[PDB]
Write a protein that binds this DNA or RNA. Structure first.
Ligand SMILES: [Zn+2]
Lengths: 237, 98, 99, 83, 120, 98, 87, 108, 99
DNA sequence: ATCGATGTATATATCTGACACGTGCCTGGAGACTAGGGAGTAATCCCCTTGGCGGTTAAAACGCGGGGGACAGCGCGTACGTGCGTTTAAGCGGTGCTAGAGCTGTCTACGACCAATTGAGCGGCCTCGGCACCGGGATTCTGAT
DNA sequence: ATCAGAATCCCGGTGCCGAGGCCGCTCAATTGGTCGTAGACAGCTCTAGCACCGCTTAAACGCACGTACGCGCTGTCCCCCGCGTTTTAACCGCCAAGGGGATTACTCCCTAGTCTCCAGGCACGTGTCAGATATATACATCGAT
């Protein structure tokens, strides 16, 4: 019923307000929610509200699964994000592990060679890196992007309130990282209409449309959601 | 009415071209190719006539020796027919493609 | 003891002095140093040998900045050659400054 | 077609004759473009050295000696044109 | 007068004059004693020292990165092999060289391995 | 009761011996083999300790590089098992037997 | 025997598991049982070719020990340069 | 006294005195000892005598009276030791040995 | 005329003189003579180059008959080397007769 | 097994330009000589090499079990060889022009040799911390349920 | 996938011997300078390289046809892998002892350098016969009947 949903979303606004180290986890539904190209799709309200929750300090760190890269497109500060499956906008240097950002999507997938040879110049007048650039799409069930996993695990081992939006926790280790927030004695909240394997484990369970919940949550925090002012590219908060 | 069976005239061509001194590429086409390549390195070059002949002798000897090693690979794989992967295996094992 | 010492030259101090310029907080083992010393001797013998052939084919007596430059351009592949040529010209022009 | 590119001057029958001189009985239809790529790479490596020896001599003409020295460097010594 | 040299110039080495770490004087002396040609001009050893220094700085840059990735801080022969073979220009330059204690790059030919599920 | 699948331990062995860098042939047997070979060229030769280590490094690196090329030949013939004919093909293309 | 020994059969000391480990470093998954006698043959031919040169370098030097430099120069001649032994 | 060329004194046709200049002016070493040009001329003569013997026999088997580039290639490649000495050399207009792999030939 | 002849040296007369000693009725074409001249120059460059390395490794300033002999023993394969060293010593000892 | 027509052979005469030989010229090999340093030769120090022995315990060797790989068969589909008629342009010979290879002359900036002066680089010694080892605690998996 | 439980990872302790710094001394680099020739620059001449014209006919091209090869799949056998027990000798640490590397001092045989002498080797010329071509004719062999 809508009155119970509203009371549970009020209590979620209290949990989010009161918690000192909020970690978001997101899955493909929230970015799909505009009716989903990866280049042409504008970010959904949920993403923009996450940016606004970040702006007020109601977000410690962000994890996502969404291969769309709309978190990257929204210029959510890259340093506070993990996109555990890889992103159609992001490639990496093999030889020296620097990263990049681009106007075009990468297009290839599976950690294959994208036809660019890096750009990092060097003192002492040595060659530029010349190292092969490689796509970030993992294919399936390898070791994740190493830093993105370490940070996501670390933040989970260090968070008092995880919140999981448009998420099925079923992909390991990804959705299991939210059990490290729980295991240390932190709270857990899950928001989905779909089933999930760890569904029993949370402090609060919501069933409802995630953009409606997040729009309500923002209204209860007294915050306007920022409309997207075209694409964003902030490496850093 | 008459027609020789397939592969027998190819086998006659093996038997013939292995008996001869002659160069096997057309000479003016090889001139234009050598000039097209050299113009990437320096504009307005000339060639001695014998410099083109030295390039043709070396390049035809190289292609023949490559095809001989390519044949060894095709035969080892239980094929009569040379394929691009045989050229690539020969060139990898010789240290050209590595 | 007994005045029977015999010095052996090596590139070791120069390779070390270059290493601390490229990576200040890094060291090198005695086997890695022996490998680097052998690498320098090989590349030196290649470049000097081709500079010798270049001089001889042209009936010149002198190895110069030319001959070394074209030996380097023949021997090194790729951009390794263009960077080596840029560094060689930079060193020779700096050395010719105030002549 | 009058608009021939120079690398297509190394005709299919010229490649067949080179393969037959090398003892090849049967030739796949994809061999010809691969063989042209191989030949262009071989000629770029020999000509780059021959042009380097030419420029080093301060002259505009590629000589038979510049080709022989390029081939001797490549480890492909050619007898017939000089020492 | 030669008493100027006895009291002036203070032995600014050809290396320090050229802005080099490698020994210009030693490279020159080796070019003369190695019988490579009848004469050796003043720019030849400066140029050759600059090139040998560039190539050593290139290998030490890549070897120091390989050492750091192995969490080590002293370079050992393994790091020189990992540096040389992962660079396409150095691997072609050192194509006929075996490095002692260096081993080989981790590499399995792909048809030897098993295979995996998917769901998109 | 427990039994790894044949070929999976062999695969771990690849990964381990590619990670490592020590010498793989036993040192005393290699010394005796080198002395038996050298005895055909001169009687009563003696060897520096580093000289035998250098022969082992070079011969052991050559054997490894030959097995890489042999594996390429085995795979090219649609096999996973190396056989004497693969060593023979690699040595023929490299110009060792040719 | 304290002096003037003669040797034979030492080639079988290049053990079956030693040949296996070399094939492992070179990426080999599976090895036919005939490979060991073929690889012993190849190793012996290679090792004779390096030793013949190494011993001709000792004879030219008029000395009775094979040194590391003799082996290094023997390998360098054959287009197989070894770094790490002082060359 | 009347001059005798060092070749005739050494009992060989190749020019000892020329090979001595070519050594001294080739910058091979600081000094070239008097036995070195004699030994080197004798070896070059022996190697040319082997390749010309084999080439003359190949030409006579082909019923010609002049040696041409086929006969030099036939002589080198049919000999297991000259082929290994000339392993990387290519001879202009020499052709290749007549070989066909046994499995390519007809079944009967 | 104006002295532009310049005088190009070759082994042509000596290859011919050896041919007539071995096969009296046979002759040689100008292309084949050019190949034979190139062969001599190549084998000369190899033996002289290896003799230079042997002299240098042993710290010797002179190439002697020992350096040419070891260079021949290293370069020539198999039985061809053994006949070459026999012809080499025979020539050197004959040249040292009465000397 | 025979039969036929195709291509390689073979026999002939005939015409032609490359090689073999002859002659003139000038360059470089030779002859007899001198000067000094390279390397032959012997005597010594003492390094490191070869040999022998006794314990240990890691690796090699032998066996046995069984499963995954080689490879011989056979089936099917398309790709490549043989052929023939039409189009292209390579090859030839001839004529024209002038860029640049090649040689000869003149000059001077470069670098080999040399002696006198000094500090950059080597061998040796010593300190201490990067890292090989490991035994202990956790987690991060893989087998047990 | 749920359940403990391996199976391995991450970490703190410990320890040693190899890397880095310091010292002192000796010999290789530097300095200033002179000498003479390698080679850079200019001027000329005449080779051979590039461009163009048009003619011939060998070659490349392109389209049709069908045979045989590539390679996809499958079944059967045996050969190699993994693992458990026993046997072996590799390894290591010690100790013995002398062969032969490496360095030194002596000293004379050898080879760079020199001037002049002269005949060998190169370029230029011309003649003819080894070989290439055109034509006639016999045999070899492939493939169909
Ligand atoms: Zn990079």
């Amino acid at each position: 019923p809508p009155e119970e949903l509203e009371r549970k979303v009020w209590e979620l606004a209290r949990l989010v307000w009161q918690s000192s180290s909020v970690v978001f986890h997101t899955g493909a539904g929230i970015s799909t929610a505009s009716g989903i190209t990866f280049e042409s799709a504008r970010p959904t309200q949920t993403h923009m509200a996450l940016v606004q929750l970040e702006r007020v300090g109601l977000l410690r760190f962000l994890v996502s699964q969404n291969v769309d890269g709309l978190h990257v497109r929204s210029g959510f500060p890259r340093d506070k994000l993990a996109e555990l499956h890889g992103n159609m906008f992001v490639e990496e240097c093999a030889k020296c592990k620097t990263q990049y950002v681009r106007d075009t999507v990468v297009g290839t997938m599976g950690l294959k060679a994208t036809g660019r040879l890096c750009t990092v110049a060097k003192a002492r007048g040595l060659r530029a890196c010349r190292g092969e650039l490689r796509d970030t799409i993992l294919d399936w069930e390898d070791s994740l992007p190493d830093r993105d996993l370490a940070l996501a695990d670390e933040a989970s081992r260090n968070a008092d309130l995880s919140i999981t939006l448009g998420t099925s926790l079923q992909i390991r280790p990804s959705g299991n990282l939210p059990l490290a927030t729980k295991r240390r004695g932190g709270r857990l909240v899950i928001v989905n209409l779909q089933p999930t394997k760890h569904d029993r484990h949370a402090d609060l369970r919501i069933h409802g449309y995630v953009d409606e919940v997040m729009t309500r949550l923002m209204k209860h925090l007294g915050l306007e959601i920022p409309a997207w002012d075209g694409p964003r590219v902030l490496e850093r908060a | 009415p008459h027609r020789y069976r397939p592969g027998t005239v190819a086998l006659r061509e093996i038997r013939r071209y292995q008996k001869s001194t002659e160069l096997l590429i057309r000479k003016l086409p090889f001139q234009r190719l050598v000039r097209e390549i050299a113009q990437d390195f320096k504009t307005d070059l000339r060639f001695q006539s014998s410099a083109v002949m030295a390039l043709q002798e070396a390049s035809e000897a190289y292609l023949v020796g490559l095809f001989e090693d390519t044949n060894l690979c095709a035969i080892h794989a239980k094929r009569v027919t040379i394929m691009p992967k045989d050229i690539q295996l020969a060139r990898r094992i010789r240290g050209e493609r590595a | 003891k007994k005045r029977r010492k015999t010095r052996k030259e090596s590139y070791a101090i120069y390779v070390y002095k270059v290493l601390k310029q490229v990576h200040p907080d890094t060291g090198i083992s005695s086997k890695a140093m022996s490998i680097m010393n052998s690498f320098v001797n090989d590349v030196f013998e290649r470049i000097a040998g081709e500079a010798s052939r270049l001089a001889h084919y042209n009936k010149r007596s002198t190895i110069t900045s030319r001959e070394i430059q074209t030996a380097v351009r023949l021997l090194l592949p790729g951009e390794l050659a263009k960077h080596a040529v840029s560094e060689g010209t930079k060193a020779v022009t700096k050395y010719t400054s105030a002549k | 077609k009058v608009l021939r590119d120079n690398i297509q001057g190394i005709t299919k029958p010229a490649i067949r004759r080179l393969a037959r001189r090398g003892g090849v009985k049967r030739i796949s239809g994809l061999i010809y473009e691969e063989t042209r790529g191989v030949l262009k790479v071989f000629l770029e490596n020999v000509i780059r050295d021959a042009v380097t020896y030419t420029e080093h001599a301060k002259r505009k003409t590629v000589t038979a000696m510049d080709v022989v020295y390029a081939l001797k460097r490549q480890g492909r010594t050619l007898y017939g044109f000089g020492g | 007068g030669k008493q100027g040299g006895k009291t002036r110039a203070k032995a600014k080495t050809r290396s320090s004059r050229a802005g080099l770490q490698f020994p210009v004087g030693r490279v020159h002396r080796l070019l003369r004693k190695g019988n490579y040609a009848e004469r050796v001009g003043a720019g030849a050893p400066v140029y050759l020292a600059a090139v040998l220094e560039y190539l050593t700085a290139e290998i030490l840059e890549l070897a120091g990165n390989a050492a750091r990735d192995n969490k080590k801080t002293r370079i050992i022969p393994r790091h020189l092999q990992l540096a040389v073979r992962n660079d396409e220009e150095l691997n072609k330059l050192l194509g006929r060289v075996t490095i002692a204690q260096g081993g080989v790059l981790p590499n399995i030919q792909s048809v030897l391995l098993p295979k995996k599920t998917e769901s998109a």
